[PDB]
Design a protein around this ligand. Structure first.
Ligand code: MG
Ligand code: MG
Ligand code: MG
Ligand code: MG
Ligand code: MG
Ligand code: MG
Lengths: 200, 169, 98, 178
RNA sequence: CCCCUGAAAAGAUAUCGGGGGUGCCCAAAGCUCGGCUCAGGCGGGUCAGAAAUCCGCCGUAGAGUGUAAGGGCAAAAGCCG
C-alpha cells in the first residue's frame, strides 16, 4: 500500500472469503470437504479435495438443480437445502466418496441452519459427515412446516400481505401451505431416481 | 592525551552504537558548516575546493576541530563570511578506547596490566577512506589562492596525508 | 564466555523474515503426500518454530522413511552420523534434483 | 410521521436517506447505585434495555479501573429511535448547531437535564442526569461494510454527506439548524 | 544455565571479550470455542478536562504478548466473553 514494508494480505483474505486458520485446520483432516455456501438466492454444495496447486471439486451444485426434479418451493429454504444435500450426496457416492468433513466457511454454525440441512441431506444420501446431535434442524423445518404455518397465519390475518410475500409461489403454482406434501413428492422422485441409478 | 599515532590506524570494527557503549563521549565540534550556508546565496559560488584524504585511517575529533578553526578563521579574515561556504564533511562516529588504570570507572579498571583489557571511552574519531572528501569549500574564482592557503593550513593539523582538488560546481 | 547452547542459540538470521514474507504462509506444503522413499528438503518455517527441527538440519536433503500420525520420519546425515528427523510437512519441501 | 416514511429521497430510489440509528449515552464516574439509577433512567426514558459500558483503560485521576462499568448506552432503531428522537429534539428546543454535524452523516447533541424531555417527572431517588444523543444517518447499501462475508468498502457516492444530513434534519425532521 | 554480538552467508568455534538476564512468577499469566482489534490521530457529543463513557473516519502494528535478548504473531499468538 504505502511503502515496501507493507505486507498485502492474501487475495482471498482481503476479498473476505477464506478464513485461512479454519482452512488449515480443515486441511489437516486429509478428508474431502463438504463445502456449503449461502447466497441471497441459492445454496451451493460441493465435495472438494484439496491439492497443492488448487482444490479439486468432485461434485458441485447449486439449488438450480432442483428444477430438474420439479421443485416449486423456494430456492434456498431448509427443504431446498435438504434436497440439494441429497442430490450432492448421491452424486458423491456415485463418484466414490464415502466420508466428508463439513466446511461452512465464514457462516455461523447455529443449530437448525441451512448448512446443517444440507449436511443432513448428504448423510441421508449415504455419505458420513461427523456432526453433533443438536445442530441438524427438526424434521418439521426440513419438510417446511414452518413456511406452511407462516403462510396459513398470513392468509388468515392479512391476505394481501400473504399474496405480496408469497407471490412467486403462486406464480409457480404451489401455495406455501402445500409445501410439505410437495417436498415429500420431490424427495421421493430424487430418491427413486438415484437409487435406480445406483442399482443399475 | 595520547599521541594521535596511537589511534591513526584502523585496527578493528567500528564502535558507534551509543546505546551499548557506556559513558560514550559527546561530540565537541560546535558547528560543521561555515560561511554562507543558504543555497540561494551559494548559487553565486562556482568553484569547489576539496581537501581529500590520501590514506585510510582515523582522524580524531580534536584534530578535525583544530583544522576547522584554522581554515574558518583564515577564510573569515581574508575572504569574509559572505563569500564562501565551508563544510567539514565527516562526522566522528567512531568511539576510541584506552586501557588504563584510573579513578572511579568500574571495578575492572582497578586490575593492572592486560587483565580485563577492554578499555573505556577516550574520545571520538572519523574513519576515512582514500579519496574521501574531508573539507568542502564553495567559493568565487577570485579567492582561489586564499582558499588553497586555508586548505593547506587545515591539512597541517590532520594525521593523514591529503590533497587539494579544485573543480567547477 | 563459552558459547551457550539453547535449542535455538544462533538463530537470529535463520529465524528472521523479510517484510514481504510476514504473517501466515501458504498452505500448499501441507498438501504434499510423501511416500516412503521420497526425497525432501528441510526448510524451516519460522512461524511454526515449536515443531521445527534444529538449525543444523536447515537445507539438508532427507529420505522419507514413514509416517507417524501426521509427521514424517526422515533419515538424514549430519556429516557422517545417521539422524532421524520427525517433522510435519510445513517444514519440508519436495526435492526436485533427485 | 413514522420511521418508514421519515426518508429524504433524491432523484434515485437507492439514494434515499433514513435514520440508521439513535444512540443514547450516559457516562457516570464509577458508582454502583449511581450507575443503576442511570441504567433505570435510560430504560424508562427510551423503552429499551440499556447496556453497561466498561472502562477501557484505568485512569487513576478519575478513579476508574479498566473493565469496570462506567457507562450506560442504548441503541435505538426504527420506531423507538424516531419517538425518542422527537422527544429529545423537543427537549433540546428543536435547535441544533450546524457545527455539531460531522462530515459523515453523524450528528450528536447533549441534553443537560432530562427533565426537559416531555413525559418525565422529577424524582428524588434518581436525581437529575444528562445524556448524549447521537443520530447516525445512512443510505441503502451500508451493509457492504458491516456484513461478515465479502466485507468491502462502500463507494463514495452512496455515503451520507454533511450537507445531506443537514438538509435531512431541516426538511424532514423540521429542526432549526444554525 | 539462557539471548544478541564477536562468528569470517553449511556445521563448530575462545579470551578476567562486549550488551544483558537466570535460581522465578501465575488456578489463571494453564486448555479450548467464539467475538473483536491495538498504539496513535482526526471530526461530533451534558457534567467531561490532555485523559472517563458515546457516534463515526483513518490507522502494517508505530500496541500487546508475565520476566533478559533475539525471533514469531492481526477474522491472531493480542483484547473480551
Ligand atoms: Mg584488529
Ligand atoms: Mg564448549
Ligand atoms: Mg510449548
Ligand atoms: Mg555457521
Ligand atoms: Mg518464557
Ligand atoms: Mg483465538
Amino acid at each position: 500500500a504505502r511503502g515496501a514494508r507493507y505486507k498485502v494480505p492474501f487475495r482471498r483474505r482481503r476479498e473476505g472469503v477464506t478464513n485461512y486458520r479454519k482452512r488449515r485446520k480443515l486441511l489437516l483432516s486429509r478428508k474431502p470437504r463438504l463445502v456449503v455456501r449461502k447466497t441471497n438466492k441459492h445454496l451451493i454444495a460441493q465435495i472438494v479435495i484439496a491439492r497443492p496447486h488448487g482444490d479439486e471439486t468432485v461434485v458441485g451444485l447449486d439449488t438450480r438443480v432442483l428444477s430438474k426434479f420439479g421443485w416449486k418451493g423456494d430456492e434456498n429454504n431448509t427443504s431446498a437445502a435438504y434436497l440439494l444435500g441429497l442430490i450432492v450426496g448421491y452424486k458423491a457416492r456415485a463418484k466414490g466418496i464415502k466420508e466428508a468433513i463439513l466446511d461452512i466457511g465464514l457462516h455461523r454454525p447455529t443449530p437448525g441452519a441451512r448448512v446443517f440441512a444440507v449436511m443432513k441431506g448428504v448423510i441421508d444420501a449415504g455419505v458420513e459427515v461427523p456432526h453433533g446431535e443438536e445442530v441438524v434442524p427438526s424434521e418439521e423445518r426440513i419438510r417446511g412446516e414452518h413456511v406452511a404455518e407462516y403462510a396459513k397465519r398470513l392468509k388468515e390475518e392479512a391476505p394481501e400481505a400473504y399474496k405480496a410475500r408469497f407471490s412467486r409461489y403462486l406464480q409457480r403454482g404451489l401455495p406455501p401451505e402445500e409445501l410439505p406434501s410437495h417436498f415429500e413428492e420431490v424427495k421421493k422422485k430424487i430418491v427413486e431416481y438415484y437409487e435406480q441409478k445406483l442399482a443399475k | 592525551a595520547r599521541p594521535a599515532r596511537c589511534y591513526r590506524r584502523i585496527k578493528g570494527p567500528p564502535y558507534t552504537r551509543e546505546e551499548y557503549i557506556h559513558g560514550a563521549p559527546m561530540i565537541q565540534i560546535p558547528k560543521f558548516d561555515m560561511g554562507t550556508t543558504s543555497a540561494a546565496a551559494r548559487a553565486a559560488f562556482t568553484m569547489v575546493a576539496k581537501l581529500v584524504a590520501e590514506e585510510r585511517g582515523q582522524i580524531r575529533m580534536q584534530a578535525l576541530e583544530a583544522a576547522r578553526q584554522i581554515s574558518s578563521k583564515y577564510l573569515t579574515k581574508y575572504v569574509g563570511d559572505a563569500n564562501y561556504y565551508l563544510r567539514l564533511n565527516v562526522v566522528p562516529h567512531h568511539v576510541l578506547r584506552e586501557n588504563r588504570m584510573l579513578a572511579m570507572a568500574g571495578a575492572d579498571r582497578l586490575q593492572e596490566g592486560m587483565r580485563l583489557a577492554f578499555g573505556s571511552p577516550a574520545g571520538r574519531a572519523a574513519r576515512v577512506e582514500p579519496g574521501q572528501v574531508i573539507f568542502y569549500v564553495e567559493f568565487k574564482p577570485e579567492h582561489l589562492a586564499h582558499v588553497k592557503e586555508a586548505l593547506r593550513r587545515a591539512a597541517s593539523k590532520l594525521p593523514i596525508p591529503t590533497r587539494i582538488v579544485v573543480e567547477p560546481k | 564466555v563459552k558459547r551457550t547452547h539453547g535449542y535455538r542459540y544462533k538463530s537470529r538470521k535463520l529465524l528472521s523474515k523479510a517484510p514481504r514474507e510476514r504473517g501466515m504462509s501458504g498452505l500448499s506444503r501441507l498438501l504434499y503426500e510423501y511416500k516412503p522413499g521420497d526425497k525432501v528438503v528441510i526448510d524451516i518455517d519460522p512461524t511454526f518454530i515449536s515443531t521445527a527441527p534444529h538449525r543444523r538440519y536447515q537445507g539438508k536433503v532427507g529420505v522419507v522413511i514413514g509416517t507417524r500420525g501426521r509427521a514424517y520420519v526422515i533419515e538424514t546425515y549430519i556429516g557422517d552420523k545417521k539422524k532421524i528427523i520427525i517433522t510435519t510437512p510445513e517444514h519440508l519441501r519436495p526435492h526436485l534434483g533427485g | 410521521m413514522k420511521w418508514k416514511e421519515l426518508v429524504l429521497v433524491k432523484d434515485h430510489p437507492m439514494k434515499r436517506v433514513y435514520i440508521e440509528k439513535v444512540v443514547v449515552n450516559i457516562g457516570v464516574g464509577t458508582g454502583g447505585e449511581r450507575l443503576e439509577k442511570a441504567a433505570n433512567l435510560l430504560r424508562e426514558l427510551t423503552g429499551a434495555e440499556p447496556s453497561l459500558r466498561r472502562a477501557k483503560r484505568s485512569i487513576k485521576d478519575f478513579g476508574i479501573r479498566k473493565g469496570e462499568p462506567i457507562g450506560v448506552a442504548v441503541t435505538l432503531r426504527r420506531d423507538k429511535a424516531v419517538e425518542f428522537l422527537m422527544r429529545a429534539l423537543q427537549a433540546v428546543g428543536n435547535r441544533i448547531k450546524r457545527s455539531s454535524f460531522d462530515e459523515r452523516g453523524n450528528v450528536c447533541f447533549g441534553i443537560k437535564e432530562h427533565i426537559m424531555l416531555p413525559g418525565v417527572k422529577y424524582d428524588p431517588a434518581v436525581g437529575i442526569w444528562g445524556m448524549d444523543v447521537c443520530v447516525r444517518l445512512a443510505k441503502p447499501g451500508l451493509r457492504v461494510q458491516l456484513r461478515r462475508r465479502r466485507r468491502s468498502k462502500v463507494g463514495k457516492g452512496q455515503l451520507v454527506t454533511r450537507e445531506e444530513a443537514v438538509e435531512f434534519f431541516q426538511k424532514v425532521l423540521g429542526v432549526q439548524v444554525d
